[PDB]
Homo-oligomer: A and B are copies of this chain.
Amino acid sequence: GSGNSHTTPWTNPGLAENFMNSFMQGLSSMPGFTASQLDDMSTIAQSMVQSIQSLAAQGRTSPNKLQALNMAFASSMAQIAASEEGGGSLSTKTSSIASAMSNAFLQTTGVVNQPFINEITQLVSMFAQAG
């Protein structure tokens, strides 16, 4: 083919890595996070990117596994925002996550998946509530 079926972070491991990198790049210019919190998020994002690079190198990714891993990434960001206090309100942190996701979409596909973003923002609230 041409790659017409490998055009999103959910079907293309390289695009998933770029999405995750781009999320972390954008988030660093948004309100609500301390340096130390950004550092933790970048460590976890880099861990997720390497995990995907390694699965890709092995030939072991699939659409379903990539969807699972993109949700894993977004959940880990939601979790850490809910666990780490200081730096801004829950509400500020949440909309910064949403903005960072949104801009990562624009940087990677050129198209924001709003229902995906809305899930992620529901995760922050859920994890904080539980916290």
- Size of A's binding interface in residues, CB under 8 A: 35
> How often does this chain occur in the complex, in copies?
2
Residues of B within 8 A of A122 (CB): 126
Decide yes or no whether A106 CB sits under 8 A from chain B: no
CB distance from A33 to the nearest CB of B (A): 13
At the interface, is chain A mostly helix, strand, loop or mixed? helix
Are B40's CB and A68's CB within 8 A? yes
Decide yes or no whether A89 CB sits under 8 A from chain B: no
State in angstroms the CA–CA spacing of A73 and B71 once bound together.
9
Question: Could you jot down 13 A-B contacts, CB within 8 Å?
Answer: A43-B65, A44-B72, A47-B51, A47-B55, A67-B80, A68-B80, A71-B127, A72-B73, A72-B75, A72-B76, A118-B130, A119-B126, A122-B126
Residues of B within 8 A of A71 (CB): 75-76, 78-79, 127
Q: Which of B40, B55, B72 contacts A43 (CB 8 A)?
A: B55
